């Protein structure tokens, strides 16, 4: 039908979740100009006639649509594998944001050019207080940019380093992670990277997850198949650690292992499977039945020890294997202060004392090293193609 | 400048039908990219493979949704050109009757003539003049370019001169219509470069309107930019005066019966044009020699003694009764059109054969 055709056709161009969205279609024309404008390629009569027709307008569009120049970089608050997070202020609106830039070169070289898609969807369409919001997503020939919600309270690895965390506080932050992970599992995702570095605090001192670059969409049975181990050497689970070609089948239970590791470091001060060599950690995780030992001097309760050991076991005997309510039911979470249904509405243990909209007291100082860039191509390579459709505004 | 104002201007370019980076033109890019990249040799590239696995499925969904040649039923082949043909079509859903021009993408890539259609597109789509054949829809596939236009049931002026012994009264009318038609094209900043009776078509009322614009070119700076109708200055930048030469050639052929510079060999015609100085009314002769004038303005042409008549006025010429009005029995009547017969390689690396056609798609209203 003619009428039904243009109803669906126009639906595909305004939809923010659509692959062929208005802002995603421009990314194609933009990447094409980036990848074709070279002397060797310009020798082609077809490539030359395209560039002479679209280079003029594509430059005007480059100035109009969101660019890195529109943002005033205040301070580098974080640093990752493929980039760094900066505290930015938009030059026109004067709004304060946290911007994460991802190196397109480091992504092409290391063949890791697909991890950002799930993170882009989760942050933009989560609609949960447990997830750091993504306001704008843009790009250029060199980087991918993610203009997100700024967390003035800082990361949790900054909290345990600056405070001697008691059990009362540990009870709160663990319960927040449990509720936050359940929200991610509700969207049908396994985080595969639960660590205090990814847990960030807002202006009120409440927890919300931030790095969703290790997330995977769960199947109808709540499982996932992976030929590659992903996470952090200390927080990684034994079933997801040995995950290789053939034997790489696991559910959401691997995310509960990382909660136990987190609670241990929160109370003991060190990770449970820490070793001076990275291979030593690997062997300790697989031998958790004999490797997991608590220090002789204890500030920690019997129920906290039970909750750690309930999480730090084999997948088939691990806590949370039969719903999230199984975890909520544990004796360690039984308290007089808060309730599960209204946990984010109660007062946080630490509330950040903020003097200005650009306060970075909770983030420890970092150096602002030279990077590599793509060589000129002798023929079409299309290095900008795996990034087409990343641009988001809504 | 400012954030809020940048989003308004960016949204304008996306909706604007005259814009190069229009909504329908942006899809052409993604469409051409899938056409040119989906090959085994190219799919060996990790970047090309990851793009196609992500966009080929959704682009095929769009190809079905967007306008196709399958949406129209071909009634009769009314015309034929160098790179294509003109067919009388009926849109299967709306049942509307149109004239559809096809252009071979292979013939354009081979012969290197992959830019002539751009002026033909802009003139027809954004003219908003009764003197220009309207373009309703413009679409494409991996094989052709399609131009869904206004159908002219009255036919071409070549058929008129062949079927009627054209008197001066008729010649005065059709010449004045061409003059008003060319003035409208010059107003848009375009020079025809090939004004001939084959390009002049008649509507249901018998009124003239120009159609073939493959020889046109946009005016450089102020106003500067095929045989026998070719002007000597073209032969060798020239202005809009070259189109007025072709009007005189047209008026001559309409009254005499033959072209003024006709020769049995094509080479002979070329020499006769350059030697125009040596190669049935006095006022008709005065006009033919005047064009062989109009350099200053169009009013100079209108104020000639040949155009002085009791029948029509220059301001209301298209509103008066035409000399010949086509007798049409049906919406698919092709009596004024003479009958005609009904009837690339896999790349080893990126060639981008669909790239000079990106941005051709147009949808009116
Ligand atoms: C192995 N492959 C799969 C997954 C993967 N993943 C990557 N990731 C990165 O390259 C990266 C860059 C900058 C920053 C971060 C992380 C780690 C440090 C803090 N951070 C925040 O995103 N912080 C934050 C996030 C949101 C808001 C605020 C604030 N305020 C801070 C990560 S390469 C890569 C490759
Ligand atoms: C060297 N280069 C110069 C520019 C150029 N140009 C070309 N041209 C073509 O390929 C072509 C195809 C079909 C039809 C026509 C022309 C000539 C015959 C009729 N016609 C109508 O366009 N007719 C009409 C146009 C609009 C409405 C109706 C009706 N009814 C009829 C031309 S190759 C070429 C290459």
Curated annotation (Swiss-Prot), chain A:
Residues the entry annotates as binding ATP: 77-85, 100
Key words, A-Z: Acetylation, Apoptosis, ATP-binding, Cell membrane, Cell projection, Coiled coil, Cytoplasm, Cytoskeleton, Golgi apparatus, Kinase, Magnesium, Membrane, Metal-binding, Nucleotide-binding, Phosphoprotein, Serine/threonine-protein kinase, Transferase, Zinc, Zinc-finger
UniProt superkingdom: Eukaryota
AGC-kinase C-terminal domain location: 336-394
Location(s), subcellular: Cytoplasm; Cytoplasm, Cytoskeleton, Microtubule organizing center, Centrosome, Centriole; Golgi apparatus membrane; Cell projection, Bleb
Biological process according to GO: actin cytoskeleton organization; actomyosin structure organization; aortic valve morphogenesis; apical constriction; bleb assembly; blood vessel diameter maintenance; cortical actin cytoskeleton organization; embryonic morphogenesis
Function: Protein kinase which is a key regulator of the actin cytoskeleton and cell polarity. Involved in regulation of smooth muscle contraction, actin cytoskeleton organization, stress fiber and focal adhesion formation, neurite retraction, cell adhesion and motility via phosphorylation of DAPK3, GFAP, LIMK1, LIMK2, MYL9/MLC2, TPPP, PFN1 and PPP1R12A. Phosphorylates FHOD1 and acts synergistically with it to promote SRC-dependent non-apoptotic plasma membrane blebbing. Phosphorylates JIP3 and regulates the recruitment of JNK to JIP3 upon UVB-induced stress.
Subunit structure: Homodimer. Interacts with RHOB, RHOC, MYLC2B and PTEN. Interacts with ITGB1BP1 (via N-terminus and PTB domain). Interacts with RHOA (activated by GTP), CHORDC1, DAPK3, GEM, JIP3, RHOE, PPP1R12A, PFN1, LIMK1, LIMK2 and TSG101. Interacts with FHOD1 in a Src-dependent manner. Interacts with SHROOM3.
Family in the record: Belongs to the protein kinase superfamily. AGC Ser/Thr protein kinase family.
Free-text comment about domains: The C-terminal auto-inhibitory domain interferes with kinase activity. RHOA binding leads to a conformation change and activation of the kinase. Truncated ROCK1 is constitutively activated.
The name this protein goes by in its record: Rho-associated protein kinase 1
Organism: Homo sapiens
UniProt lineage: Eukaryota, Metazoa, Chordata, Craniata, Vertebrata
From Swiss-Prot, chain B:
Residue stretches making up the Protein kinase domain: 72-307
Tissues where this protein is expressed: Detected in blood platelets.
Active site location: 194 (proton acceptor)
Residue ranges of every copy of the AGC-kinase C-terminal domain listed in the record: 310-365
Residues reported to bind ATP: 78-86, 101
Domain of life: Eukaryota
Post-translational modification: Autophosphorylated on serine and threonine residues.
Protein location: Cytoplasm; Cytoplasm, Cytoskeleton, Microtubule organizing center, Centrosome, Centriole; Golgi apparatus membrane; Cell projection, Bleb
Family from the record: Belongs to the protein kinase superfamily. AGC Ser/Thr protein kinase family.
Physiological role: Protein kinase which is a key regulator of the actin cytoskeleton and cell polarity. Involved in regulation of smooth muscle contraction, actin cytoskeleton organization, stress fiber and focal adhesion formation, neurite retraction, cell adhesion and motility via phosphorylation of DAPK3, GFAP, LIMK1, LIMK2, MYL9/MLC2, TPPP, PFN1 and PPP1R12A. Phosphorylates FHOD1 and acts synergistically with it to promote SRC-dependent non-apoptotic plasma membrane blebbing. Phosphorylates JIP3 and regulates the recruitment of JNK to JIP3 upon UVB-induced stress.
Oligomer and partners: Homodimer. Interacts with RHOB, RHOC, MYLC2B and PTEN. Interacts with ITGB1BP1 (via N-terminus and PTB domain). Interacts with RHOA (activated by GTP), CHORDC1, DAPK3, GEM, JIP3, RHOE, PPP1R12A, PFN1, LIMK1, LIMK2 and TSG101. Interacts with FHOD1 in a Src-dependent manner. Interacts with SHROOM3.
Record note on domains: The C-terminal auto-inhibitory domain interferes with kinase activity. RHOA binding leads to a conformation change and activation of the kinase. Truncated ROCK1 is constitutively activated.
Name of this chain's protein: Rho-associated protein kinase 1
Covered residues, full protein: 6 to 402 of 1354
């Amino acid at each position: 039908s003619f009428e039904t055709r243009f109803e669906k056709m126009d639906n595909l161009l305004r939809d923010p979740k659509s692959e062929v969205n208005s802002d995603c279609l421009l990314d194609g024309l933009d990447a094409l100009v980036y990848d074709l404008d070279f002397p060797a390629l310009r020798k082609n009569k077809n490539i030359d006639n395209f560039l002479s027709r679209y280079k003029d307008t594509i430059n005007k569009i480059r100035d109009l649509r969101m660019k890195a120049e529109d943002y005033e970089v205040v301070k580098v608050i974080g640093r990752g594998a493929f980039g760094e997070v900066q505290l930015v202020r938009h030059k026109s609106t004067r709004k304060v944001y946290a911007m994460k830039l991802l190196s397109k070169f480091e992504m092409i070289k290391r063949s890791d050019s697909a991890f950002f898609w799930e993170e882009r969807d989760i942050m933009a369409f989560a609609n949960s207080p447990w997830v750091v919001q993504l306001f704008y997503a843009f790009q250029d020939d060199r980087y991918l940019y993610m203009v997100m919600e700024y967390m003035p309270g800082g990361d949790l690895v900054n909290l345990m380093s600056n405070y001697d965390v008691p059990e009362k506080w540990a009870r709160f932050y663990t319960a927040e992670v449990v509720l936050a992970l359940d929200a991610i599992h509700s969207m049908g995702f396994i985080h595969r990277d639960v660590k205090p570095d990814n847990m960030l605090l807002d202006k009120s001192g409440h927890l919300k997850l931030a790095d969703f670059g290790t997330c995977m969409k769960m199947n109808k049975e709540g499982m996932v198949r992976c030929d590659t181990a992903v996470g952090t050497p200390d927080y990684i689970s034994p079933e997801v650690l040995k995950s290789q070609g053939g034997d790489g089948y696991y559910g959401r239970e691997c995310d509960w292992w990382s909660v136990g590791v987190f609670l241990y470091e929160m109370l003991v001060g060190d990770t449970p499977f820490y070793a001076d060599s990275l291979v030593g950690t690997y062997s300790k995780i697989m031998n958790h039945k004999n490797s997991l030992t608590f220090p002789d001097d204890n500030d920690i309760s019997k129920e906290a020890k039970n909750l750690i050991c309930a999480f730090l076991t084999d997948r088939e005997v691990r806590l949370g294997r039969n719903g999230v309510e199984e975890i909520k039911r544990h004796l360690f979470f039984k308290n007089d202060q808060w309730a599960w249904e209204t946990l984010r509405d109660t007062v946080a243990p630490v509330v950040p004392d903020l003097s200005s909209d650009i306060d970075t007291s909770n983030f420890d100082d970092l150096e602002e090293g030279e990077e590599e860039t793509f060589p000129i191509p002798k023929a079409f390579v299309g290095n900008q193609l795996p990034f087409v459709g990343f641009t988001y505004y809504s």
